[PDB]
DNA sequence: CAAACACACCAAACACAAGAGCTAATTGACTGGCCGTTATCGATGTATATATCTGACACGTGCCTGGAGACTAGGGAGTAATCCCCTTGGC
């Protein structure tokens, strides 16, 4: 499992959310126009019903 | 017939194998040639110890010269009487 976790971490170690509110990597290539397709931190999110 | 690319196959390598944390003990190069120091073997003595021969001193034996002993031969030195020459003595 450790080798898997290492390989995963090294492949996305530089992706981040720039102040333009978009997700890019070191090469400034846009990966997502908004973080998680919504632009919200995963901390303050709760399950709900429609 | 020769050249283009594609596919299947064979043959050759690359890199990875979680995070680490503690403790112990096995390995401590080696023949050989050669130079450089030094220990040893060897000669060439001069100093000291010992042996042979020569020289001076000592004790001892000796050959030689002169001296000494017993005994002898026979005569030199020497009593006892005598004469009377000559000396001392005298007026």
XYZ file of N, CA and C (backbone and C1' of nucleotides) in Angstrom:
787
model
N 0.818 -1.207 0.000
C 0.000 0.000 0.000
C 0.854 1.261 0.000
N 2.006 1.230 0.672
C 2.835 2.422 0.758
C 3.342 2.878 -0.597
N 3.766 1.929 -1.431
C 4.239 2.282 -2.765
C 3.135 2.953 -3.569
N 1.913 2.427 -3.481
C 0.778 3.054 -4.153
C 0.619 4.490 -3.678
N 0.657 4.696 -2.363
C 0.448 6.037 -1.835
C 1.546 6.984 -2.291
N 2.790 6.512 -2.316
C 3.879 7.341 -2.817
C 3.628 7.742 -4.262
N 3.332 6.762 -5.119
C 3.142 7.066 -6.533
C 2.011 8.063 -6.728
N 0.910 7.890 -6.000
C -0.185 8.845 -6.102
C 0.276 10.241 -5.709
N 1.006 10.353 -4.599
C 1.356 11.672 -4.081
C 2.286 12.394 -5.040
N 3.222 11.666 -5.645
C 4.195 12.299 -6.524
C 3.573 12.788 -7.818
N 2.432 12.235 -8.203
C 1.793 12.571 -9.463
C 0.947 13.828 -9.374
N 0.597 14.258 -8.170
C -0.254 15.418 -7.963
C 0.277 16.255 -6.816
N 1.598 16.367 -6.713
C 2.191 17.084 -5.594
C 2.175 18.591 -5.784
N 1.977 19.076 -7.008
C 2.049 20.500 -7.293
C 0.712 21.124 -7.664
N -0.329 20.327 -7.904
C -1.632 20.901 -8.206
C -2.071 21.770 -7.041
N -2.690 22.905 -7.347
C -3.142 23.807 -6.297
C -4.212 24.728 -6.858
N -4.830 25.490 -5.963
C -5.903 26.411 -6.311
C -5.320 27.818 -6.315
N -5.106 28.367 -7.508
C -4.574 29.710 -7.645
C -5.654 30.745 -7.344
N -5.215 31.981 -7.094
C -6.140 33.038 -6.699
C -7.137 33.389 -7.790
N -6.964 32.873 -8.998
C -8.000 32.996 -10.010
C -9.149 32.039 -9.761
N -9.141 31.341 -8.629
C -10.186 30.381 -8.300
C -10.274 29.287 -9.362
N -9.123 28.713 -9.693
C -9.053 27.612 -10.637
C -7.922 26.691 -10.221
N -8.006 25.437 -10.647
C -7.057 24.412 -10.238
C -6.044 24.219 -11.347
N -4.778 24.448 -11.026
C -3.701 24.328 -11.987
C -2.526 23.643 -11.317
N -1.575 23.212 -12.132
C -0.369 22.553 -11.668
C 0.827 23.464 -11.930
N 2.030 22.915 -11.766
C 3.230 23.735 -11.876
C 3.349 24.391 -13.243
N 2.812 23.763 -14.286
C 2.967 24.272 -15.644
C 1.821 25.226 -15.955
N 1.081 25.630 -14.926
C -0.059 26.534 -15.056
C -1.141 25.983 -15.973
N -1.088 24.700 -16.304
C -2.154 24.086 -17.080
C -3.390 23.953 -16.207
N -4.537 24.385 -16.730
C -5.776 24.313 -15.967
C -6.282 22.879 -15.962
N -6.581 22.362 -14.772
C -7.054 20.991 -14.629
C -8.545 21.006 -14.338
N -9.005 22.044 -13.648
C -10.417 22.210 -13.340
C -10.705 23.695 -13.242
N -11.728 24.160 -13.958
C -12.068 25.574 -13.881
C -12.509 25.968 -12.482
N -12.872 24.997 -11.650
C -13.182 25.242 -10.252
C -12.844 23.992 -9.462
N -12.386 24.178 -8.230
C -11.989 23.037 -7.421
C -13.167 22.096 -7.212
N -12.973 20.826 -7.560
C -14.022 19.839 -7.385
C -15.268 20.116 -8.186
N -15.157 20.888 -9.260
C -16.270 21.304 -10.100
C -17.263 22.187 -9.359
N -17.001 22.531 -8.098
C -17.866 23.464 -7.381
C -17.135 24.617 -6.706
N -15.874 24.469 -6.317
C -15.165 25.567 -5.693
C -15.482 25.688 -4.220
N -15.431 24.566 -3.505
C -15.781 24.512 -2.094
C -14.850 23.562 -1.357
N -14.421 23.965 -0.165
C -13.555 23.105 0.628
C -14.321 21.880 1.101
N -13.647 20.732 1.090
C -14.284 19.496 1.502
C -14.559 19.399 2.985
N -14.090 20.363 3.775
C -14.332 20.324 5.210
C -15.777 20.664 5.544
N -16.282 21.774 5.019
C -17.605 22.266 5.394
C -18.640 21.805 4.373
N -18.861 20.498 4.352
C -19.867 19.895 3.491
C -20.487 18.723 4.234
N -21.816 18.698 4.300
C -22.553 17.677 5.027
C -23.509 16.985 4.070
N -23.833 15.732 4.369
C -24.847 15.025 3.598
C -26.207 15.679 3.792
N -27.052 15.608 2.766
C -28.412 16.125 2.854
C -29.296 15.346 1.891
N -30.564 15.742 1.821
C -31.540 15.079 0.970
C -32.290 16.110 0.144
N -32.663 15.708 -1.067
C -33.358 16.575 -2.014
C -34.847 16.268 -1.922
P 12.276 -11.672 -59.496
O 12.692 -10.143 -59.311
C 13.711 -9.587 -60.115
C 13.975 -8.139 -59.721
C 14.356 -7.930 -58.248
O 15.492 -7.069 -58.119
C 12.453 -6.607 -58.810
P 16.249 -6.941 -56.705
O 15.745 -5.541 -56.107
C 16.025 -4.326 -56.785
C 15.172 -3.205 -56.228
C 15.310 -3.019 -54.716
O 15.596 -1.676 -54.371
C 13.021 -3.211 -55.336
P 16.059 -1.334 -52.873
O 14.842 -0.493 -52.268
C 14.399 0.674 -52.916
C 13.057 1.112 -52.368
C 13.025 1.224 -50.841
O 12.596 2.529 -50.402
C 11.183 -0.068 -51.660
P 12.687 2.930 -48.842
O 11.160 3.011 -48.343
C 10.294 4.076 -48.777
C 8.855 3.772 -48.420
C 8.640 3.383 -46.977
O 8.296 4.523 -46.196
C 7.485 1.865 -48.474
P 8.453 4.476 -44.599
O 7.208 3.598 -44.141
C 5.918 4.064 -44.407
C 4.876 3.004 -44.079
C 4.799 2.644 -42.585
O 3.468 2.797 -42.066
C 5.023 0.679 -43.936
P 3.193 2.673 -40.483
O 2.572 1.209 -40.298
C 1.347 0.860 -40.930
C 1.128 -0.627 -40.833
C 1.205 -1.146 -39.403
O 0.026 -1.817 -39.026
C 2.583 -2.440 -40.865
P -0.307 -1.986 -37.464
O 0.013 -3.522 -37.156
C -0.660 -4.538 -37.868
C 0.068 -5.861 -37.739
C 0.323 -6.303 -36.295
O -0.414 -7.488 -35.976
C 2.267 -6.577 -37.692
P -0.526 -7.979 -34.450
O 0.470 -9.228 -34.375
C 0.371 -10.281 -35.317
C 1.614 -11.143 -35.260
C 2.005 -11.541 -33.836
O 2.194 -12.936 -33.692
C 3.847 -10.500 -34.965
P 2.471 -13.541 -32.226
O 4.065 -13.681 -32.154
C 4.768 -14.378 -33.173
C 6.249 -14.056 -33.127
C 6.918 -14.344 -31.777
O 7.729 -15.525 -31.822
C 7.675 -12.294 -32.802
P 8.392 -16.097 -30.472
O 9.830 -15.399 -30.422
C 10.733 -15.562 -31.503
C 11.916 -14.617 -31.370
C 12.688 -14.759 -30.049
O 14.056 -15.124 -30.272
C 12.218 -12.464 -30.558
P 14.965 -15.640 -29.047
O 15.757 -14.331 -28.576
C 16.563 -13.615 -29.502
C 16.882 -12.229 -28.967
C 17.385 -12.215 -27.521
O 18.778 -11.954 -27.443
C 15.811 -10.443 -27.975
P 19.491 -11.890 -26.000
O 19.322 -10.357 -25.538
C 19.900 -9.295 -26.313
C 19.501 -7.944 -25.763
C 19.854 -7.741 -24.305
O 21.066 -7.004 -24.205
C 17.650 -6.885 -24.869
P 21.758 -6.771 -22.774
O 21.199 -5.354 -22.333
C 20.350 -5.245 -21.221
C 19.643 -3.917 -21.255
C 19.582 -3.205 -19.913
O 19.702 -1.783 -20.098
C 17.372 -3.695 -20.659
P 20.239 -0.828 -18.917
O 19.027 0.173 -18.717
C 17.770 -0.364 -18.398
C 16.903 0.656 -17.731
C 17.320 0.975 -16.311
O 17.052 2.330 -16.011
C 15.276 -0.297 -16.320
P 17.570 2.951 -14.629
O 16.372 2.678 -13.598
C 15.128 3.366 -13.713
C 14.084 2.718 -12.815
C 14.517 2.539 -11.354
O 13.759 3.373 -10.489
C 13.385 0.593 -12.216
P 14.123 3.460 -8.926
O 12.925 2.712 -8.181
C 11.584 3.000 -8.516
C 10.683 1.895 -8.023
C 11.079 1.328 -6.675
O 10.477 2.035 -5.594
C 10.540 -0.440 -8.248
P 11.083 1.869 -4.115
O 10.557 0.434 -3.653
C 9.164 0.215 -3.521
C 8.839 -1.270 -3.461
C 9.568 -2.045 -2.394
O 8.985 -1.809 -1.091
C 9.454 -3.307 -4.437
P 9.710 -0.808 -0.058
O 8.508 -0.068 0.689
C 7.340 0.299 -0.017
C 6.573 1.383 0.733
C 7.448 2.451 1.394
O 6.977 3.762 1.094
C 6.022 1.429 3.029
P 7.972 5.025 1.188
O 7.782 5.559 2.671
C 8.777 5.310 3.626
C 8.353 5.837 4.969
C 9.479 5.986 5.965
O 10.098 7.276 5.829
C 7.624 4.845 6.963
P 11.599 7.406 5.266
O 12.521 7.290 6.573
C 12.769 6.020 7.169
C 12.023 5.888 8.479
C 12.884 5.692 9.718
O 13.211 6.939 10.327
C 11.031 4.121 9.665
P 14.532 7.059 11.236
O 14.242 6.097 12.471
C 13.498 6.552 13.574
C 13.490 5.511 14.677
C 14.846 4.947 15.061
O 15.515 5.784 15.977
C 13.216 3.213 14.940
P 17.079 5.562 16.263
O 17.135 4.180 17.050
C 16.710 4.118 18.402
C 16.920 2.722 18.962
C 18.357 2.238 18.990
O 19.028 2.657 20.172
C 16.885 0.516 18.167
P 20.613 2.435 20.312
O 20.780 0.862 20.183
C 20.703 0.065 21.341
C 20.882 -1.405 21.006
C 22.282 -1.793 20.587
O 23.145 -1.986 21.688
C 20.696 -2.863 19.172
P 24.728 -2.103 21.433
O 24.899 -3.516 20.714
C 24.762 -4.704 21.463
C 24.891 -5.910 20.562
C 26.276 -6.121 19.988
O 27.016 -7.025 20.802
C 24.580 -6.290 18.261
P 28.599 -7.179 20.596
O 28.714 -7.764 19.122
C 28.498 -9.113 18.926
C 28.950 -9.541 17.553
C 30.431 -9.372 17.290
O 30.860 -10.472 16.470
C 29.219 -8.032 15.759
P 32.340 -10.626 15.865
O 32.052 -11.466 14.534
C 31.699 -10.790 13.333
C 32.588 -11.212 12.213
C 34.066 -11.253 12.578
O 34.778 -12.205 11.766
C 33.494 -9.252 11.337
P 36.359 -12.065 11.518
O 36.401 -10.945 10.382
C 37.619 -10.422 9.925
C 37.393 -9.500 8.731
C 38.463 -8.447 8.543
O 39.500 -8.938 7.741
C 36.307 -7.437 8.412
P 40.693 -7.956 7.310
O 41.384 -7.542 8.697
C 40.855 -6.469 9.496
C 41.779 -5.256 9.454
C 43.233 -5.551 9.793
O 44.127 -4.545 9.215
C 42.265 -4.317 11.560
P 44.214 -4.264 7.619
O 44.455 -5.703 6.939
C 44.938 -5.787 5.575
C 45.328 -7.207 5.203
C 46.747 -7.584 5.597
O 46.882 -8.976 5.791
C 46.618 -7.314 3.231
P 48.303 -9.586 6.229
O 49.038 -9.869 4.840
C 48.516 -10.840 3.965
C 49.345 -10.931 2.690
C 50.862 -11.021 2.938
O 51.445 -12.137 2.237
C 50.375 -9.355 1.334
P 52.799 -11.970 1.378
O 53.193 -13.463 0.966
C 54.570 -13.845 0.847
C 55.089 -13.673 -0.570
C 56.602 -13.775 -0.633
O 57.027 -14.444 -1.766
C 55.926 -11.599 -1.320
P 58.602 -14.634 -1.980
O 59.069 -13.262 -2.666
C 58.833 -13.023 -4.048
C 59.246 -11.607 -4.430
C 60.692 -11.246 -4.088
O 61.495 -11.202 -5.260
C 59.168 -9.455 -3.591
P 63.074 -10.935 -5.141
O 63.238 -9.393 -5.522
C 62.758 -8.898 -6.754
C 63.101 -7.430 -6.896
C 64.553 -7.104 -6.580
O 65.084 -6.148 -7.500
C 63.096 -5.988 -5.043
P 66.668 -5.854 -7.555
O 66.842 -4.547 -6.672
C 66.140 -3.377 -6.999
C 66.054 -2.480 -5.790
C 67.385 -2.237 -5.085
O 68.038 -1.049 -5.561
C 65.502 -2.482 -3.556
P 69.426 -0.570 -4.903
O 68.988 0.497 -3.791
C 68.207 1.624 -4.136
C 67.756 2.368 -2.885
C 68.905 2.943 -2.055
O 68.615 4.257 -1.589
C 67.612 1.468 -0.715
P 69.766 5.112 -0.858
O 69.475 4.924 0.707
C 68.336 5.507 1.323
C 68.217 5.012 2.751
C 69.449 5.276 3.626
O 69.068 5.929 4.846
C 68.810 3.002 3.758
P 70.172 6.627 5.789
O 69.965 5.889 7.198
C 69.828 4.462 7.221
C 69.407 3.955 8.586
C 70.469 4.102 9.658
O 69.889 4.145 10.955
C 70.305 1.820 8.978
P 70.826 4.258 12.256
O 71.241 2.740 12.584
C 70.296 1.795 13.115
C 70.791 0.364 12.890
C 71.960 -0.051 13.795
O 71.585 -1.065 14.724
C 72.280 -0.779 11.547
P 72.632 -1.497 15.864
O 72.949 -3.038 15.552
C 71.895 -3.982 15.426
C 72.420 -5.300 14.887
C 73.540 -5.912 15.726
O 73.356 -7.310 15.912
C 74.279 -5.588 13.484
P 74.421 -8.154 16.775
O 75.403 -8.778 15.672
C 74.892 -9.678 14.690
C 75.897 -9.896 13.563
C 77.217 -10.526 14.022
O 77.386 -11.848 13.492
C 77.574 -8.754 12.461
P 78.631 -12.760 13.959
O 79.692 -12.632 12.763
C 79.384 -13.132 11.465
C 80.462 -12.738 10.461
C 81.869 -13.239 10.822
O 82.535 -13.831 9.695
C 81.901 -10.888 10.480
P 83.970 -14.540 9.884
O 85.033 -13.401 9.502
C 85.250 -13.037 8.138
C 86.118 -11.796 8.043
C 87.525 -11.974 8.619
O 88.504 -11.858 7.585
C 86.566 -9.897 9.265
P 90.032 -12.276 7.851
O 90.790 -10.877 7.965
C 91.001 -10.118 6.804
C 91.796 -8.860 7.107
C 93.119 -9.088 7.843
O 94.212 -8.519 7.092
C 91.727 -7.477 9.014
P 94.152 -6.989 6.602
O 94.779 -6.179 7.819
C 95.037 -4.804 7.676
C 95.411 -4.196 9.014
C 96.733 -4.705 9.561
O 97.546 -3.606 9.887
C 95.087 -4.823 11.242
P 99.061 -3.834 10.355
O 98.890 -4.541 11.776
C 99.611 -4.113 12.911
C 98.806 -3.080 13.706
C 98.986 -3.138 15.204
O 100.155 -2.352 15.604
C 96.657 -3.076 14.696
P 100.218 -0.757 15.368
O 100.371 -0.162 16.851
C 99.433 0.780 17.346
C 98.832 0.305 18.678
C 99.838 0.143 19.830
O 99.381 0.779 21.010
C 98.535 -1.800 19.659
P 100.346 0.809 22.293
O 99.545 0.000 23.419
C 98.311 0.490 23.907
C 97.686 -0.504 24.860
C 98.604 -0.916 26.009
O 97.911 -0.989 27.249
C 97.961 -2.833 24.755
P 98.740 -1.225 28.607
O 98.544 -2.786 28.925
C 97.270 -3.284 29.298
C 97.238 -4.812 29.259
C 98.152 -5.489 30.289
O 97.430 -6.438 31.077
C 98.491 -6.438 28.160
P 98.180 -7.255 32.241
O 98.288 -8.755 31.672
C 97.118 -9.532 31.414
C 97.504 -10.917 30.927
C 98.517 -11.632 31.822
O 98.161 -12.984 32.055
C 99.356 -11.477 29.598
P 99.035 -13.860 33.082
O 99.995 -14.735 32.140
C 99.441 -15.671 31.232
C 100.479 -16.137 30.212
C 101.684 -16.859 30.834
O 101.850 -18.172 30.301
C 102.396 -15.255 29.254
P 103.026 -19.117 30.864
O 104.114 -19.162 29.682
C 103.838 -19.822 28.447
C 105.038 -19.733 27.522
C 106.320 -20.342 28.096
O 107.009 -21.131 27.136
C 106.697 -18.077 27.502
P 108.298 -21.977 27.594
O 109.532 -21.253 26.871
C 109.598 -21.174 25.452
C 110.710 -20.232 25.012
C 112.093 -20.622 25.537
O 113.044 -20.736 24.484
C 111.653 -18.334 25.990
P 114.479 -21.401 24.776
O 115.476 -20.155 24.892
C 115.643 -19.267 23.802
C 116.201 -17.938 24.281
C 117.581 -18.042 24.957
O 118.578 -17.279 24.268
C 116.071 -16.687 26.212
P 120.128 -17.432 24.681
O 120.458 -16.082 25.480
C 120.309 -14.822 24.844
C 120.372 -13.688 25.863
C 121.677 -13.643 26.656
O 122.263 -12.353 26.617
C 119.837 -13.534 28.125
P 123.717 -12.126 27.262
O 123.428 -11.350 28.631
C 122.974 -10.004 28.627
C 122.665 -9.553 30.041
C 123.842 -9.691 31.016
O 124.039 -8.492 31.784
C 121.934 -10.788 31.869
P 125.352 -8.322 32.700
O 124.785 -8.304 34.203
C 123.897 -7.275 34.635
C 123.348 -7.587 36.015
C 124.424 -7.799 37.082
O 124.077 -7.185 38.324
C 123.064 -9.738 36.909
P 125.123 -7.207 39.547
O 124.474 -8.215 40.610
C 123.170 -7.981 41.113
C 122.650 -9.201 41.858
C 123.553 -9.669 43.010
O 122.827 -9.772 44.239
C 122.961 -11.485 41.595
P 123.603 -10.113 45.605
O 123.362 -11.687 45.826
C 122.054 -12.202 46.135
C 122.078 -13.714 46.135
C 123.144 -14.326 47.038
O 122.566 -14.935 48.175
C 123.000 -15.419 44.891
P 123.530 -15.492 49.329
O 123.587 -17.066 49.055
C 122.395 -17.811 48.983
C 122.651 -19.195 48.404
C 123.678 -20.019 49.199
O 123.201 -21.341 49.492
C 124.282 -19.926 46.900
P 124.101 -22.349 50.374
O 124.962 -23.156 49.289
C 124.308 -23.975 48.320
C 125.296 -24.503 47.291
C 126.511 -25.227 47.889
O 126.428 -26.644 47.668
C 127.084 -23.834 46.031
P 127.580 -27.633 48.202
O 128.536 -27.814 46.931
C 128.013 -28.320 45.710
C 129.057 -28.246 44.599
C 130.359 -28.995 44.914
O 130.645 -29.982 43.941
C 130.822 -26.827 44.077
P 132.009 -30.828 44.047
O 133.101 -29.916 43.315
C 133.025 -29.637 41.916
C 134.165 -28.720 41.523
C 135.556 -29.287 41.804
O 136.174 -29.749 40.607
C 135.371 -26.950 42.301
P 137.577 -30.524 40.686
O 138.617 -29.524 39.999
C 138.322 -28.905 38.762
C 139.341 -27.814 38.473
C 140.783 -28.303 38.543
O 141.606 -27.717 37.547
C 140.399 -26.653 40.227
P 143.162 -28.128 37.475
O 143.927 -26.980 38.297
C 143.805 -25.606 37.926
C 144.311 -24.704 39.035
C 145.755 -24.967 39.487
O 146.618 -23.912 39.077
C 144.249 -24.552 41.316
P 148.208 -24.084 39.213
O 148.572 -23.202 40.494
C 148.169 -21.849 40.549
C 148.242 -21.313 41.973
C 149.613 -21.492 42.633
O 150.236 -20.235 42.908
C 147.833 -22.153 44.098
P 151.763 -20.188 43.417
O 151.632 -20.134 45.010
C 150.862 -19.119 45.623
C 150.437 -19.533 47.017
C 151.613 -19.770 47.979
O 151.503 -18.984 49.177
C 150.083 -21.563 48.053
P 152.539 -19.202 50.392
O 151.708 -20.080 51.438
C 150.404 -19.682 51.861
C 149.869 -20.661 52.884
C 150.807 -20.890 54.072
O 150.106 -20.873 55.323
C 150.330 -22.941 52.993
P 150.919 -21.048 56.702
O 150.607 -22.551 57.165
C 149.273 -22.982 57.378
C 149.230 -24.481 57.533
C 150.142 -25.049 58.621
O 149.429 -25.963 59.417
C 150.516 -26.150 56.571
P 149.815 -26.178 60.958
O 149.853 -27.760 61.084
C 150.119 -28.530 59.927
C 150.004 -29.996 60.236
C 150.871 -30.438 61.389
O 150.385 -31.673 61.942
C 151.853 -31.077 59.313
P 150.835 -32.189 63.401
O 151.504 -33.614 63.098
C 152.343 -33.766 61.954
C 152.841 -35.185 61.816
C 153.791 -35.616 62.913
O 153.828 -37.029 63.039
C 154.991 -35.037 60.909
P 154.908 -37.728 64.005
O 156.239 -37.827 63.115
C 156.312 -38.733 62.021
C 157.585 -38.509 61.221
C 158.887 -38.654 62.024
O 159.602 -39.814 61.638
C 158.914 -36.755 60.549
P 160.918 -40.239 62.450
O 162.115 -39.693 61.545
C 162.209 -40.087 60.187
C 163.167 -39.185 59.422
C 164.554 -39.082 60.050
O 165.514 -39.837 59.306
C 163.730 -36.939 59.297
P 167.030 -39.979 59.825
O 167.811 -38.811 59.061
C 167.761 -38.722 57.652
C 168.597 -37.554 57.158
C 170.040 -37.578 57.626
O 170.901 -36.959 56.672
C 168.895 -35.753 58.652
P 172.477 -37.282 56.656
O 173.134 -36.045 57.432
C 172.940 -34.730 56.958
C 173.359 -33.713 58.000
C 174.568 -34.142 58.837
O 175.482 -33.041 59.051
C 172.821 -33.573 60.236
P 176.318 -32.387 57.836
O 176.463 -30.855 58.271
C 175.453 -29.940 57.933
C 175.061 -29.073 59.131
C 176.236 -28.476 59.917
O 175.958 -27.108 60.300
C 174.860 -29.638 61.368
P 176.546 -25.876 59.447
O 175.817 -24.590 60.045
C 174.478 -24.324 59.716
C 173.733 -23.801 60.927
C 174.473 -22.709 61.699
O 173.596 -21.671 62.119
C 174.110 -24.600 63.099
P 174.193 -20.375 62.861
O 173.748 -20.568 64.391
C 172.404 -20.908 64.694
C 172.242 -21.308 66.150
C 172.864 -20.345 67.158
O 172.008 -20.164 68.288
C 173.821 -22.506 67.410
P 172.463 -19.244 69.524
O 173.212 -20.274 70.492
C 172.529 -21.418 70.976
C 173.386 -22.177 71.959
C 174.185 -21.279 72.900
O 173.894 -21.651 74.275
C 175.588 -22.893 71.875
P 174.820 -21.238 75.526
O 174.787 -22.566 76.438
C 175.218 -22.520 77.810
C 175.777 -23.867 78.285
C 176.704 -23.733 79.480
O 176.510 -24.763 80.389
C 177.921 -24.618 77.636
P 177.019 -24.566 81.892
O 178.582 -24.905 81.817
C 179.005 -26.231 81.651
C 180.514 -26.304 81.480
C 181.335 -25.434 82.444
O 182.393 -26.207 83.043
C 181.946 -24.974 80.185
P 183.321 -25.595 84.212
O 184.803 -25.672 83.618
C 185.074 -25.168 82.326
C 186.463 -25.547 81.882
C 187.558 -24.877 82.693
O 188.753 -25.646 82.715
C 187.402 -23.894 80.515
P 190.069 -25.071 83.441
O 190.797 -24.207 82.305
C 191.311 -24.841 81.140
C 191.855 -23.812 80.149
C 192.808 -22.786 80.767
O 194.169 -23.102 80.490
C 191.325 -21.808 79.139
P 195.340 -22.108 80.967
O 195.537 -21.113 79.735
C 195.846 -21.608 78.455
C 195.961 -20.465 77.463
C 196.988 -19.400 77.843
O 197.742 -18.991 76.706
C 194.853 -18.403 77.606
P 199.224 -18.396 76.888
O 199.028 -16.825 76.747
C 198.400 -16.297 75.614
C 197.935 -14.892 75.893
C 198.930 -14.065 76.714
O 199.059 -12.760 76.187
C 196.833 -14.028 77.724
P 199.913 -12.495 74.856
O 199.011 -11.476 74.026
C 198.023 -11.960 73.159
C 196.859 -10.996 73.111
C 197.272 -9.541 72.964
O 196.369 -8.824 72.163
C 196.130 -9.830 75.014
P 196.716 -7.312 71.756
O 195.916 -6.433 72.815
C 194.548 -6.642 73.000
C 194.080 -5.951 74.259
C 194.492 -4.471 74.376
O 193.382 -3.659 74.618
C 194.958 -5.650 76.353
P 193.492 -2.063 74.485
O 192.022 -1.568 74.894
C 191.062 -2.519 75.417
C 190.928 -2.402 76.929
C 190.973 -0.968 77.450
O 189.691 -0.539 77.915
C 192.267 -2.488 78.817
P 189.424 1.010 78.261
O 189.569 1.057 79.850
C 188.782 0.189 80.636
C 189.319 0.101 82.050
C 189.414 1.461 82.747
O 188.722 1.487 83.990
C 191.473 0.284 82.899
P 188.648 2.861 84.826
O 189.987 2.864 85.714
C 190.225 1.841 86.683
C 191.642 1.932 87.221
C 192.046 3.319 87.736
O 192.050 3.362 89.160
C 193.797 2.219 86.534
P 192.337 4.745 89.932
O 193.930 4.798 90.050
C 194.617 3.901 90.914
C 196.113 4.146 90.846
C 196.518 5.604 91.067
O 197.037 5.805 92.391
C 197.768 4.542 89.298
P 197.229 7.292 92.982
O 198.768 7.617 92.714
C 199.771 6.794 93.262
C 201.137 7.199 92.731
C 201.468 8.684 92.933
O 202.745 8.866 93.543
C 201.710 8.067 90.630
